[PDB]
């Protein structure tokens, strides 16, 4: 078992748990709709979240490639989230320092359109075994983030942010 904080805004949303595993964040991930950077638990109205958000990340060696998920397990509710989760956009071979417009999207980002409860946005970040190892599921619903980092050696997430998000 890993240590965590019983205070980390993953841990108390229950991120980690329902969708992750414990990690240490090692890995900048900055997520931004206009002007607001997603940090831990802010609110985003979904007409704020139309757009893919620009979305910046740091990185180990200049020779490393990252994946970023973005998945919301609370669909259609978080209370029957029978569609767990819901994969919203994903984007692979991102090169360490860049981003996604640098990386190559390969399931089209879906802006989150809650209609039930309130919703956890999650993006999170791995570390690649190589370039082009990764490869789009063929639905978007029942996605599994802690299957689909085993099936593609991606590891423990090396970052991972969120929104909440509620029908307007």
């Not at 180990?60 to 609370?74: A, G, I, Q, S, W």
């Not at 970040?125 to 990764?134: A, D, K, M, N, P």
């Amino acid at each position: 078992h890993m240590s965590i904080n019983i205070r980390d805004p993953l841990i108390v949303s229950r991120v980690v748990g329902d969708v992750l595993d414990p990690f240490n964040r090692s890995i900048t991930l900055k997520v931004t709709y206009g002007q607001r950077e997603v940090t831990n638990g802010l609110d985003l109205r979904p007409s704020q979240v139309q757009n893919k958000p620009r979305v910046e990340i740091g990185g180990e060696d200049l020779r490393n490639f990252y994946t970023l998920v973005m998945v919301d397990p609370d669909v259609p509710s978080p209370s029957n989230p029978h569609l767990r989760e819901y994969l919203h956009w994903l984007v692979t071979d991102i090169p360490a320092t860049t981003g996604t417009t640098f990386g190559n999207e390969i399931v089209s980002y879906e802006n989150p359109s809650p209609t039930a409860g309130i919703h956890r946005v999650v993006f999170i970040l791995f570390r690649q075994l190589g370039r082009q190892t990764v490869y789009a599921p063929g639905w978007r619903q029942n996605f599994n983030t802690r299957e689909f980092a085993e099936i593609y050696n991606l590891g423990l997430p090396v970052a991972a942010v969120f929104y909440n998000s509620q029908r307007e």
